[PDB]
Symmetry: D2
Subunit: 261 residues, 4 copies
């Protein structure tokens, strides 16, 4: 079927791309980077992240695959030596697909803007103090003061979420996790401190107290939004689909990345 391949841009990732394309030339596979059904990422998890956001409007028609030319990644989790076996099983098809949950972020102004995140979305101040009221399912939960907040996907829990003390969630759990950044807790300002894991259909909204300008990141895209009235987090109805050609368990992927390999 139709396929395309992105590359980190360095020498080793470009040459591995040209080899798979040539290998794909020996099968009924059409290269099409406009309406592809297979998207192969060669490089790292960041290269995978860019491939995800390049085709985030066609998520239900694509099965992603990641190849890591460097260290092992949680998304680019196949060694370059498996490329020739990869193009082989990709051309036959009949493979199985695995789906991971995504995070929807809505930004309301004085107008709206929606985004999808494969890892996490963070909110910080535009320079001054960061103060937001945290509203869970329309119930005011807390007034947060500190550096910022981070809402992570399940598979995103191994990224920025881990550095903030968040838990690692298996990606089969449809949920989202909220962690704090350098919260100030004293006699008069109190946060929950613990990370919070929210299930599907739970809406977490951040509302400004004074400053209405926040530096909002979604994966590696960080944009200063101005005159913000609300930031809404919830598990997305959309899922990212992976092509599965063998068994590489998430917990094993966690072990290899943080314990030793």
């Amino acid at each position: 079927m139709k396929y395309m391949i992105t590359s980190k841009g360095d020498e080793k990732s470009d040459l591995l791309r040209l080899n798979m394309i040539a290998g794909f030339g020996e099968y009924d596979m059409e290269y099409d980077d406009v309406e592809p059904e297979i998207v192969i990422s060669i490089g790292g998890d960041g290269t995978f992240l860019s491939a995800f956001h390049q085709y985030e409007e066609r998520l239900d028609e694509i099965a992603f695959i990641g190849i890591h030319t460097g260290h092992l990644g949680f998304y680019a989790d196949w060694r370059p030596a498996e490329a020739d076996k990869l193009v082989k099983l990709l051309a036959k098809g009949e493979y199985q697909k695995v789906s991971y949950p995504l995070l929807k972020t809505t930004v309301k102004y004085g107008k709206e803007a929606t985004y999808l995140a494969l890892n996490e979305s963070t909110v910080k101040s535009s320079g001054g103090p960061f103060v937001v009221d945290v509203v869970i399912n329309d119930i005011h939960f807390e007034r947060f003061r500190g550096d910022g907040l981070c809402m992570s996907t399940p598979s995103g829990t191994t990224a920025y979420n881990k550095s903030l003390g968040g838990a690692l969630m298996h990606p089969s759990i449809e949920a989202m996790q909220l962690t704090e950044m350098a919260s100030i807790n004293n006699r008069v300002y109190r946060t929950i401190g613990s990370p919070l894991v929210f299930p599907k259909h739970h809406v977490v909204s951040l509302q400004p107290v004074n400053d209405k300008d926040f530096q909002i990141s979604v994966d590696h895209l960080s944009i200063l939004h101005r005159d913000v009235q609300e930031i809404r987090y919830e598990v997305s109805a959309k899922k990212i689909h992976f092509a599965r050609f063998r068994s590489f368990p998430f917990w094993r992927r966690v072990h290899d990345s943080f314990i030793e390999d």
Copy 2:
């Protein structure tokens, strides 16, 4: 139908119990503490915990209710002033039921012993050093050295799990969370550090490295087990059933307990 009421044992909880029983006497309600369908706990979350383990072999035939004579609890979450309205709606029936996940703990010896936990199960050393190999789904994940480990239910995340840095999970998520106690991480011993959230059907097993004696707790029951070969954690197939007479959201219950009320 059949019902029973447990009490913390102090004066205020005993008198509230006798009042509900007398109120129940005005309805078609038979007091039966052998095969009850309604179990009312009056006191605190600990009183609720004892009521749970008193009838853990009849979990599918019972809807639990907790009344807090002291501070608000996550299980005993109804004020004593709601007792007369409680006995009223309990007698009519037609109420809705809410189910929370439970944790199964299996202990293997040189023989087996199984337990159910409403909050958490912890493992510690019998005095010496605590060292276990952590095996997730038959894959060796890590060798843990430290004070001990804690596997928490979703609703149990607000108890001991919270004190160890674990996240707070909404109890509609069928999962279990593993946290570390004072892990030693250096050049040669490394743990994941982050809490781990496991979905249904994921089996986490602890295996001894040297000492085969561990102090194992299950909720408030702590027993020294000897000649242990394995400790297996997994989400239980059984669930605890609550009677729901109005709306008291979990996140609201979290706010009232840790932010302010």
Copy 3:
């Protein structure tokens, strides 16, 4: 002697200032905000912080006093009701002085710039990834990757240092404490994680690995420095001098601010 008074600028702090000045008019006290020997801060700890940096070149000739028109502060630690008793004991003199350690920050370019910090100095990235080599006493200690680093004074440990997990140090200890911000620790990048407390004459230097641009803060002053070659931290030879008119222990000040008052 010579004195001056700064104010937060709001109504209550301005009027308390005019009252103390009028009270000072009944004594041999000359108002001089150019070469003062007494500097009174009325407002909050931030107002005190501005008063410190306004006269940081005359630190050895000044005894500072802070009055809090709002909540209790660690520097502005005297209630407005003590103002008339304050001006009284300040005019007589013969009071005792207390000294707190300060932090010296040196920035080297491709040129040098030095600063003094009463609370802390932080280093972060100019947008991209923050990576620095940490060199303690000319010995390379670690390569830090994460959000940033914070070096705190003893009295500054109750501010940003506390939010990052740092310890609270009694200000009679001449030392400085370094804490991490959202460090990434995996198989290939490892930080110490624990906060580090350095004594006098220990030099901690940060050196760039790739990006030479860092957003450096010193108390509430945050400046983007460009083409940076080194950042040097060490306990300053200078100390801030407080006027002591009664006993308000630091640990008591910690209790009142974080436990309850």
Copy 4:
């Protein structure tokens, strides 16, 4: 002069001991394990710890040296290959001595008992809940509820203190650090959470609220004390003296143990 050598008891540590003794036989050195002036520990930090407590009543007449037959230790910080160069410089004398601060622990009953700690002293419950009032310099600081408390020496900060989130202090700082174990913080029970670093002459006392029985550890000695009325912590007037034959900085020792070697 007079000297003695302790050994871990395994084969490699025993043989290295007999070699140094034979090497000492070529010098004016008398083996005396009753009134030694040199105490050499061969094994690990635990072997060093036992050597410290074996001669804790003669601390001012002894210069300790540690040799690690296994991994590098913070006290046993000299490789076995340096033994022949060690016995050489030890016999000549004229070496320099380095002193580290120690922690004094006093236990009051309904009678008193005092102890010295090279690493730390911990207090925990005898099975039930651990609740103590924390009194700093006769001022009630907090009511602690949780697993227990740990007061660490400067050099002890790299041991149990590190696992609890405490900071690493350079041992030239005469101070002690208090850390919390799994504290419960909610609406009604609040602890400081942050570790606390106390200077010389600051007295930290723990007082029972209900249970008067506590499991108290001092380094590796753990004893159940009964009918306890008070536990007093303070920096000891005594110091441990090390023989210094070259330069092995503490921060370098920290790097080798936790970063990589």
